[PDB]
């Protein structure tokens, strides 16, 4: 493995691989 930028959908794709789609919540920003 190597460290890389993962913005937006790319972060969710990595949580998907790390957790196995089990139940993550990334705390997306609520501000307008």
């Amino acid at each position: 493995f190597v460290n890389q930028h993962l913005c937006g959908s790319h972060l969710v794709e990595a949580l998907y691989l790390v957790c196995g789609e089990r139940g993550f919540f990334y705390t997306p920003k609520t501000k307008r």
């Binding site: 493995f1 460290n3 890389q4 930028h5 993962l6 913005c7 937006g8 790319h10 972060l11 990595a14 949580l15 790390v18 957790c19 089990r22 139940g23 993550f24 919540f25 990334y26 705390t27 997306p28 920003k29």
Partner: peptide, 21 residues
């Protein structure tokens, strides 16, 4: 939070494991 940190800088699997349940 990881959703901004991994956009603005390089990410890690150790840091992402905090958000899984």
């Amino acid at each position: 939070g990881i959703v901004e940190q991994c956009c603005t800088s390089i990410c890690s699997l150790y840091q992402l494991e905090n958000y899984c349940k």
